[PDB]
Amino acid sequence: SQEYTLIKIFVSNVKDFYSIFMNSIRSSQSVLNACGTFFTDFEKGEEDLKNKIWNEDFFVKDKKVIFLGSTLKPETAYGQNYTFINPNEYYYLTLGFDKQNLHNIMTKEEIINSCPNIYVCSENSLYNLAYQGIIPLLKDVFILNKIKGEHFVGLETYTNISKIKNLYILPMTTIKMNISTGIVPCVSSDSTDDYACLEDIRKKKNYYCEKYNLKEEQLKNNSESCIELPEIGNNTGKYYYEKEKVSSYKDVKLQKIKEVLYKKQYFEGIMTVDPYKGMKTFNCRKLAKQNIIRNLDGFLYSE
C-alpha cells in the first residue's frame, strides 16, 4: 500500500474548460444517438440539475475545476512547470469535497449543492477517492463527463504552491492508468522522467504543436530546482538524463533511474527553496505533505 500526495491543480481558463466540457457532451450524445458510460444520465424530474451543470456559471461561479495530480515528491511542487496527462486515455469528471475524512452516500441534488470542486481523475482512482472521503457516492459515482486526455492538452493550470502559474497540460504516454489519478505534476528540474518527456516535446515541437493544441511558446517554462545533491548540485533530473544517455521518455532504463534518483534525493538531498532552504529532503518530504494537507492544497491518497 503506497501513499501518494495529491496536489490540487486548478484550471486557469475555466471558460475554455467549459467549451471542452460541452463539446464532449455533444460528441457523446452524437456517438450514442442510436441508443452509455460518458456521463451519468439525468432522470425525468432532474432537468433543473442538468440546466445547473451544463451552464457556464457552473464552471465559472459555482465550482472550482481541479485536476488531481499525484506525486511521491511533494517537496518539489514549487518547481512544477507543466502538468502531464495521458493523451490516449479517458479521464473522469466528478464532484468532490475540499476536505477529506482524515481531516458520504448522497443524492444527486445533494452532491450538486454540497461539493465545491469538480475533480478530473482516472477511473482507477474513483473508488479509492470515495473510500477516503474526497468524493461521495450516489445513493454509483456521479460522473459529469468522461473526456480523452488529448482534449485537455494545452490548458493552462496552476497550484497554490507553484512558483509560476502558467502550467500547461502536456501529453505523457507512459503514465500508467492503474496507478493513482493518472495526472502527474511535471517538475523537470528534479525528475529525470519529467525532464525526458519535456525534452522530447521540445526536440519534436513541430510534431507536438501540429498534433495537439500547443504552440511552441508554451514550451519555455523553467522549473525551479528544489533539491541539490552534494557532489552533483541541483537540476539533478537533467544531470541523470545526460549521465545515463537516456534515449527518450519511453526508455525502459528510466524506471530504474527514476527509482535510484528518488532514493538518493530522499536520503542525501538538501532543499534549495522556501520555506525549506538548507533543510534535508528527508525531513522536508514529511513537512511538505503535512503543509499541503493542512493548507487544503492536497490530499493523502492510498490504493
Automatic annotation (TrEMBL):
It comes from the Eukaryota. Belongs to the class-I aminoacyl-tRNA synthetase family. This is leucine--tRNA ligase. It comes from Plasmodium falciparum (isolate 3D7). The chain holds residues 273 to 687 of 1447 of the full protein.
